[PDB]
Structure formats: structure tokens, C-alpha cells
């Protein structure tokens, strides 16, 4: 597999998360990494993109709530998401444009008061 996504989970309204998309390919082939959000039965909706030389492209609705960054040298891009609301519950996908174009397998984010319920774990 080319892309490994993680950093998702369940968080209460108001919280933040930082999704990660790690590519197994070479850092020199990186051209851009875009992020998309797909709410339950909704269409995949583009959120933003980071380019190799570091420019940051954000969709009109984002208005500063989400931050795209790249690890120094772990060939990984991050999407930090703040002030989460139940409406942000979705599967978040990264897409890499390098030597070839690849989709990630998605990361589920759930924003709910039930994120404060941990008895299944402990």
C-alpha cells in the first residue's frame, strides 16, 4: 500500500484532531497532497491541498479552521482540524500527486458527546 492514514477517532464537540497521511514512496516525487471529506451519504468534498514548494490551498468554506502541514522528513502530510462539530463527522481521504496519483483508504472522524464514553475500551 502506498498511503497509510491514521490519527482519526471520536472526539467531543469543540475538540481538535490531527489526521496523518504517510506515503511509502520517495519524498522527491512528492508534488501535492489534497484532502477531502465525505459525510455519510454525501459526495467527496475537497478541503485543501499542500504543494511541494509549500504553498497552501484552501477551499472557500474553510476560513481558517483547518490547517494542512507536512512533516519535516517523515514523508507525511497532516490535516489539523479544530473547533470540531457534529457536522464534521465524515470519512477524510488524502490523495497524493507524485510519480503516480493515489487515493488513501480514508479515516473516520466522529464528533459526538458519546466520544466521552469509554467503557468499551476500559
Residue numbers in the entry: 2 to 123
Give the article text.
The lower EC50 of the sdAb ZC can be rationalized by the minimal restructuring evident between bound and unbound interface residues.
Here, we characterize a trio of semisynthetic anti-Ebolavirus sdAb previously selected on live virus preparations and known to recognize the C-terminal region of NP to define the determinants of cross-reactivity and specificity. X-ray diffraction was then used to solve crystal structures of sdAb–antigen complexes and unbound sdAbs.
